[PDB]
Amino acid sequence: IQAKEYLENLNKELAKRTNVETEAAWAYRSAITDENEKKKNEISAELAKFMKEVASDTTKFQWRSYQSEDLKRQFKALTKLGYAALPEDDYAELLDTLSAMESNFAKVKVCDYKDSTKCDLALDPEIEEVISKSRDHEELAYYWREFYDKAGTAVRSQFERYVELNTKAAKLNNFTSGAEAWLDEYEDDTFEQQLEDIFADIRPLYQQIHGYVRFRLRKHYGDAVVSETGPIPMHLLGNMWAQQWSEIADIVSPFPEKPLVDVSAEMEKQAYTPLKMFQMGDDFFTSMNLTKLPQDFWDKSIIEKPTDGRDLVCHASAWDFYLIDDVRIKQCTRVTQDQLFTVHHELGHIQYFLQYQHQPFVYRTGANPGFHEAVGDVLSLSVSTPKHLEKIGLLKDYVRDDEARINQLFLTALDKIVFLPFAFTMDKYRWSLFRGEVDKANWNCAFWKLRDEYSGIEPPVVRSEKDFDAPAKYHISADVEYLRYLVSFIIQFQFYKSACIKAGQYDPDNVELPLDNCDIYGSARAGAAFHNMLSMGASKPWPDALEAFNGERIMSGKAIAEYFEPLRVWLEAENIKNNVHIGWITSNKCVSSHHHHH
Numbered sequence: 001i002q003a004k005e006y007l008e009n010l011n012k013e014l015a016k017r018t019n020v021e022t023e024a025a026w027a028y029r030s031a032i033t034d035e036n037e038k039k040k041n042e043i044s045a046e047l048a049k050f051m052k053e054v055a056s057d058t059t060k061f062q063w064r065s066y067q068s069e070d071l072k073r074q075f076k077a078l079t080k081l082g083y084a085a086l087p088e089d090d091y092a093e094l095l096d097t098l099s100a101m102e103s104n105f106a107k108v109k110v111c112d113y114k115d116s117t118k119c120d121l122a123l124d125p126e127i128e129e130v131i132s133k134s135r136d137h138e139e140l141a142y143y144w145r146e147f148y149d150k151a152g153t154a155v156r157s158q159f160e161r162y163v164e165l166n167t168k169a170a171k172l173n174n175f176t177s178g179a180e181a182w183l184d185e186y187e188d189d190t191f192e193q194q195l196e197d198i199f200a201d202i203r204p205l206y207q208q209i210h211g212y213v214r215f216r217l218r219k220h221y222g223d224a225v226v227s228e229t230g231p232i233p234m235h236l237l238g239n240m241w242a243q244q245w246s247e248i249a250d251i252v253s254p255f256p257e258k259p260l261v262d263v264s265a266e267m268e269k270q271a272y273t274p275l276k277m278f279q280m281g282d283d284f285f286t287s288m289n290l291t292k293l294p295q296d297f298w299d300k301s302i303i304e305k306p307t308d309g310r311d312l313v314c315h316a317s318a319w320d321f322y323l324i325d326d327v328r329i330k331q332c333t334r335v336t337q338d339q340l341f342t343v344h345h346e347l348g349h350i351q352y353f354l355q356y357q358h359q360p361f362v363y364r365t366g367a368n369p370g371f372h373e374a375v376g377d378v379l380s381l382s383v384s385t386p387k388h389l390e391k392i393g394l395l396k397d398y399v400r401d402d403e404a405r406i407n408q409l410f411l412t413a414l415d416k417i418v419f420l421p422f423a424f425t426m427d428k429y430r431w432s433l434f435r436g437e438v439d440k441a442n443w444n445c446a447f448w449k450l451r452d453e454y455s456g457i458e459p460p461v462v463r464s465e466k467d468f469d470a471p472a473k474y475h476i477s478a479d480v481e482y483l484r485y486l487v488s489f490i491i492q493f494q495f496y497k498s499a500c501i502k503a504g505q506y507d508p509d510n511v512e513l514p515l516d517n518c519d520i521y522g523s524a525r526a527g528a529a530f531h532n533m534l535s536m537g538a539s540k541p542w543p544d545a546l547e548a549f550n551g552e553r554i555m556s557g558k559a560i561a562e563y564f565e566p567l568r569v570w571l572e573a574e575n576i577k578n579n580v581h582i583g584w585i586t587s588n589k590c591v592s593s594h595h596h597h598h
């Protein structure tokens with residue numbers, strides 16, 4: 001019989017209902033109040049009962065033996081209930097503990113290091129800036145310690161129950177654990193291994209940047225502060241989680257005498273505003289013959305941090321309201337080059353939303369979570385080039401010297417290469433818990449051992465099992481899968497490469513057309529490729545989505561390693577010239593307490 005008419009009717013209802021849920025999520029995350037929190041979970045609780053009642057109905061349609069796979073694809077997807085398979089009482093408890101962590105993160109406030117009276121500094125503006133600009137290791141340590149104790153430790157109790165409920169939910173859906181459930185999204189039983197193999201290929205490059213960065217830092221801060229052969233004291237890497245290091249390029253760049261693209265100052269001196277930044281982002285898409293931002297976006301978006309004393313979630317993000325043209329971004333944008341990249345990242349999501357809007361609700365998601373994260377990043381790569389920045393005047397006079405090209409690749413290596421192992425550990429960590437591989441008594445050290453093992457990083461001060469630091473990372477507190485970023489930083493270079501080729505910007509043989517300098521801005525053929533891929537929205541496993549883009553069907557590293565190659569050959573030489581130590585001994589930062597008072 002035909003369940004097609006059923007599915008059509010059902011997706012349309014699910015969209016209407018998710019719209020209602022989305023609005024409540026938006027209100028809460030825009031104005032954090034007990035009331036909004038209540039409505040928010042209330043809606044989710046209702047939708048969850050509807051899904052259960054829709055899961056039992058599908059028992060009617062024996063799709064597991066159907067003809068036209070597309071219907072059979074929708075059923076497998078719709079019946080795959082997530083946390084919703086959970087029984088009422090548990091689901092409600094999960095919503096709560098989830099809310100407890102989320103709100104806990106966003107409400108973090110710490111006292112200023114030079115004024116124990118202020119105590120109103122939050123992560124997004126204040127503390128985020130201190131870690132970026134300060135060069136007083138003791139001050140950076142202060143802020144690190146203060147932030148981790150509030151954002152991480154204070155929520156160990158909820159996190160643990162979250163893990164328990166997450167595991168219970170997974171088994172109810174026939175998954176081994178929440179770990180395999182997340183991996184299910186990549187529809188490939190060998191995905192983790194593929195990721196393990198690509199990382200293995202790039203790791204050597206990662207261990208020519210690490211030692212080099214540890215070199216300068218120790219030269220700058222001094223021996224007693226940064227030891228050779230030991231893991232780098234995170235907090236001197238310009239980022240609260242040390243996931244990206246470009247922020248300290250001023251004390252760590254190859255040629256400090258040569259220019260270092262820092263468009264922040266020009267943006268500021270030029271009167272740039274968040275609105276202007278979003279409009280630039282918008283222009284990039286249309287210039288590629290891609291979709292212009294709809295009217296609801298400008299009316300309903302929050303592109304600047306509210307001026308009142310209300311609490312909200314300001315971790316940039318993009319929203320699909322599941323209607324037609326109702327898409328919005330919420331970002332506490334600031335005028336800086338990094339924020340400018342972020343603006344493009346989020347629009348990547350928005351574009352993807354519009355591109356697949358016409359698809360059945362179930363297919364209104366990205367093909368593979370990684371694809372959703374890579375769109376915006378592909379434009380950001382173009383925007384970051386000296387070529388495009390000179391064209392828009394945010395780089396008055398610049399010369400491609402040669403030993404200046406290194407300041408661009410290496411600068412990019414502090415964001416794209418350094419990130420890979422960081423992103424991998426975020427989920428390898430949560431996987432090991434989801435899978436009952438770690439003892440509760442070793443939860444906080446299992447984390448740092450992993451940060452140590454893969455990133456060669458360690459906390460600025462000694463932590464014990466008494467502390468619990470994983471929640472200090474937004475995504476851990478908000479229950480947002482992280483592997484998606486690791487796939488993105490990999491596949492985005494594949495997208496970028498091809499796009500640049502489809503444009504007349506990249507030629508492997510011709511110089512003056514290097515990969516690290518193509519702009520693709522204004523490219524209709526690149527936009528066309530993007531359109532073919534994006535419009536499919538999960539209607540097919542990701543290899544077909546990629547194939548729609550450039551005819552390829554495999555995830556690989558035939559891009560980054562072809563992007564950063566000149567950088568990589570420059571390091572191996574420079575490191576030997578300065579006799580730079582490569583590799584590091586195991587960290588001694590995780591223990592189980594010690595005091596000097598009695």
Ligand SMILES: NCCCC[C@H](N[C@@H](CCc1ccccc1)C(=O)O)C(=O)N1CCC[C@H]1C(=O)O
Pocket residue numbers: 315316317318342345346373480485
């Ligand atoms: N310093 C601001 C960073 C930009 C914010 C961005 N936000 C995330 C938010 C995802 C999300 C939000 C709400 C519900 C469900 C999912 C994003 O990918 O857009 C992000 O987290 N990103 C962007 C790149 C990497 C990753 C990160 O920083 O770990």
Ligand SMILES: [Zn+2]
Pocket residue numbers: 345346349372373
């Ligand atoms: Zn994103």
